[PDB]
Amino acid sequence: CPLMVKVLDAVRGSPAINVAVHVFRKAADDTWEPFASGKTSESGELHGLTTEEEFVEGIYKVEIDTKSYWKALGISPFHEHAEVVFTANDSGPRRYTIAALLSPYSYSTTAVVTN
Amino acid sequence: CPLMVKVLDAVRGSPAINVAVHVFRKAADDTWEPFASGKTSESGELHGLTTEEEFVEGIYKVEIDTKSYWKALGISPFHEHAEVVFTANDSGPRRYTIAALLSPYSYSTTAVVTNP
């Protein structure tokens, strides 16, 4: 898969498990079209969101439902979600890992783009 | 004023100056209405976006044009922008500083939320 999402929990020092992630592709009319989604695994990872064929150049938004995560942990979060918006560009580097490190009032996102 | 956006450049170790910031507020119809915009100053701060009166409860989106910022520095960054989406003032008015720390392939955003 050319796209992987990895979410870490900076409060618990753990993968952020069962975090809903939605991926959207910007449509011609500048709207976000749902493209894929999943929940992060026990390892805080979400694999298999897309395929090389499907994951064409375009602007993608990865929306990480951080709020539900924090709500599940009983911790007041600031953000509604973490939205990572990027242009996928052909095609090297090929693989995108979108890693998000979550704190209740802060998140960081990083892209590890590799071949 | 209750909403300040601060943008720092993690490559240069500097404020991120002249960064366009667009603030949107989720409307009743669940669309993003333009709320305010500006650009960061030499201090990487953007003040005066709104007022206590205008900054009512709502879901706000602060979209920081990090791409233009990096592009102006010759960098093709990963992100189109840094988007900070949050419910504001739901427990009464607060002063929000939305700080973004930018790197070409990473950004972090933090909110420092204090009482008026």
Add this chain to the structure above:
Amino acid sequence: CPLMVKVLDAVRGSPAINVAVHVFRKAADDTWEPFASGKTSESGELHGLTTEEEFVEGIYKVEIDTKSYWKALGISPFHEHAEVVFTANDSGPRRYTIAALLSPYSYSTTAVVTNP
């Protein structure tokens, strides 16, 4: 003054108040000499650590006692502290803001380095 330490709490979205900060400067004998210390104020800032005259070129270590901070909040954090080690003023005097953003198992530190 040329060295400021700012500490933010990423859990609370607040300044990290009363955080002990110890600054050391690498001596000629390559040991860490105590340089300055203080604690962050209500704004999570620690000012007045040093002066232009005293803050000469050197390798400085800012050790932020994040553990005591979290522990006081009932949290057993991962890190003993956040340690920021850097060469200062090597291209002439600069004003350094060392910002740390703290979470129990993570911290980030940034330097905003500006001219006097």
Add this chain to the structure above:
Amino acid sequence: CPLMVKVLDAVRGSPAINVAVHVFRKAADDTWEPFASGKTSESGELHGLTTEEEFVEGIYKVEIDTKSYWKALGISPFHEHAEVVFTANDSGPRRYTIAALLSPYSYSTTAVVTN
């Protein structure tokens, strides 16, 4: 291995490869004793630093030579290194991933502590 170090490069959006990492254990006299070291792999990872047997409770310092990394990339860095200092506590969670995300003037470190 109970300890893994992972280093990412926030400028290039890549693993931070060939980054020297030194691990130290605080000795009884409060000095740092070198314990282990390595360079991060192509994946920005450093495995096999220690073993469960050797990695007893104590205060450890992971010193990531970020400066040499940035120097190799021709980018002026701020920090001499990134030092992650933590108490290893028995023994759950067992495995420590010390992840560092590097920028020239900023780094973040996170511990992902799992079983």
